[PDB]
Each structure stands twice: as C-alpha cells, then as structure tokens.
Design a protein around this ligand. Structure first.
Ligand SMILES: CC(C)(C)c1nc(-c2cccc(NS(=O)(=O)c3c(F)cccc3F)c2F)c(-c2ccnc(N)n2)s1
Length: 254
C-alpha cells in the first residue's frame, strides 16, 4: 500500500498544470513532484475513482516512465512522483533550440519507444503524448508522463465520431509527430495559419506532415517509420514492438 501518512510531504512551489491536476515541486525523502487534484471532502465515488487512477499508475515500473511514488488522501487528494531535474523535449527543440546531433535524436526516439512499448504491453494508453510530456531527466533519460495540442491528435480523435477514438493506434500517431519534431526541429504545419483549418483538413483526411522538410542527415529508415506511424487509416499503423525494433536497428547502423 502506497498511502503516504499525513504531515510527511512538504509542498513547495507551483510549476503548472496539464491534462489533469496542478503540479508542485515538493519534498519527501529528497525531491518529488506533487500533483494536487483539488478535491475537497471526497465522496466515495470520487475516492474510488481516485484509487482507480492510482491503481493504473501503480501498474508501471519502467525507467522511461515517470516514477509513481505514493499518494495522500489527507489533507488533499494528491499523487507523489519522482522529480525530473531539467526540462522537456518540447522546450529543448523550440525554446532552447539545443544542438543535439542525430545520435542523441534517435536515442531520445528510442527511449520514448521503449516507454510506449511498456505502456502498451501493460494495456495502458497515454491519450495525450506529445514532446511537452517527454521529460529529459538530467538531459539523458526520457521520462514520459502527463496522462491546446491538436498537432499530435490523429484524424479519428479530431473527428470523435467513433465510440472509442483513443487507442494504441492514436498513441502511435502521436509518436509519429514527436518523430517529425525530432527530425525537422519544427512543429508540423509550419505554414498553415489557423488551428480550425488544421483541425478540418486532418479530420477530413487531406493533411499530414510534409516529410520533405526533414533535416539532410535524417536516416532513410526513419523517413519510412514516420510515414507509417502517420497513416490516416488507424489499422495501417505499426504497433510499438515493431516501432521499437526498427529504431533499435537504426540506432546500431548509426
Ligand atoms: C508542466 C506539466 C505538464 C503540468 C508537468 N507535469 C508534471 C507531472 C507531475 C506529476 C505527475 C505527472 N504525471 S501523471 O500524473 O500522469 C503520472 C503519475 F502521477 C504517476 C506516474 C506516472 C505519471 F505519468 C506529471 F506529468 C511535471 C513534472 C514531473 C516530474 N518532474 C518534473 N520536473 N515535472 S511538469
């Protein structure tokens, strides 16, 4: 059992917020992040729903997945994880503009594939993967977390006509854009000027990333892999086991 007794966790400074929760730097046996939920006086239906989430995070032990550490119910509902020192991949690519060589790009890609392969092997779907949620701890280890971001949405998710739009396949499409970014240094749809046009065309099936924009030294295997992850028909995208293996072969050739 992972319930952290009351008065042990010190809560510091507000970092920000994502899909759910508000995130803080904290302390508990060293550094932790503290994701507050803001539920005051949980009903049995909110309490069990909290433990359902806890029970999905607890199911993950992997080096490339953000490390679930504990939870509080008093004084707030809250989740404690490992603290990533450094900043995110989004930040490294379109803020710092950090000059990674291809060795490092593909390494990052490989470590993210490992995490997603793990997530999928344990039947867990991310639902909001993006470079913003790929944390480079110590500028070396990818930590995936965070289970206004339509550039990573697959067509079937932007449509939302299906009963179950989120899937492994939509997780795989999202990874394809993380690859676009990695290999172009750029967010996709550079020159389309209004998100409503990007939504429409992706959803109607008439707009995917222009892969002629990839950097000169981009591998040919990686070109092919991106193309296959970014396919419009759901069922024609590769599973992560194969994504991982093509990048692991790629990493060696390099
Ligand atoms: C800016 C933004 C996107 C709001 C952030 N969220 C978290 C954060 C903080 C805590 C948990 C989760 N992820 S989670 O809540 O989805 C989760 C768990 F709570 C447990 C295990 C895996 C996991 F992904 C986070 F994304 C961040 C975070 C996490 C660890 N270290 C640092 N420096 N930041 S940054």
């Amino acid at each position: 059992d992972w319930e952290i007794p009351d008065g042990q966790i010190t809560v510091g400074q507000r970092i920000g917020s994502g899909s759910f929760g508000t995130v803080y730097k904290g302390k508990w046996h060293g550094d932790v992040a503290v994701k507050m939920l803001n539920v005051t006086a949980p009903t049995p239906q909110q309490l069990q729903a909290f433990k359902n989430e806890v029970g999905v995070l607890r199911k993950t032990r992997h080096v490339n997945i953000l490390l679930f550490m504990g939870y509080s119910t008093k004084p707030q509902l809250a989740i404690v994880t490992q603290w990533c020192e450094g900043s995110s991949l989004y930040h490294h690519l379109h803020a710092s503009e950090t000059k990674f060589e291809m060795k490092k790009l593909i390494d990052i890609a490989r470590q993210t594939a490992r995490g997603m392969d793990y997530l999928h092997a344990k039947s867990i779907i991310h639902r909001d993967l993006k470079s913003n949620n790929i944390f480079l701890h110590e500028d070396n280890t990818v930590k995936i977390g965070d289970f206004g971001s339509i550039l990573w949405m697959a067509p079937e998710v932007i449509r939302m006509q299906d009963s179950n739009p989120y899937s492994f396949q939509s997780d795989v499409y999202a990874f394809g854009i993380v690859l676009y970014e990695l290999m172009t240094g750029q967010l996709p749809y550079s020159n389309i000027n209004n998100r409503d046009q990007i939504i429409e065309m992706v959803g109607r099936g008439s707009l995917s990333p222009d892969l002629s924009k990839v950097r000169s030294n981009c591998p040919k295997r990686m070109k092919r892999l991106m193309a296959e992850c970014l396919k419009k028909k759901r069922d024609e995208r590769p599973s992560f086991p194969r994504i991982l293996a093509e990048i692991e072969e790629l990493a060696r050739e390099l």
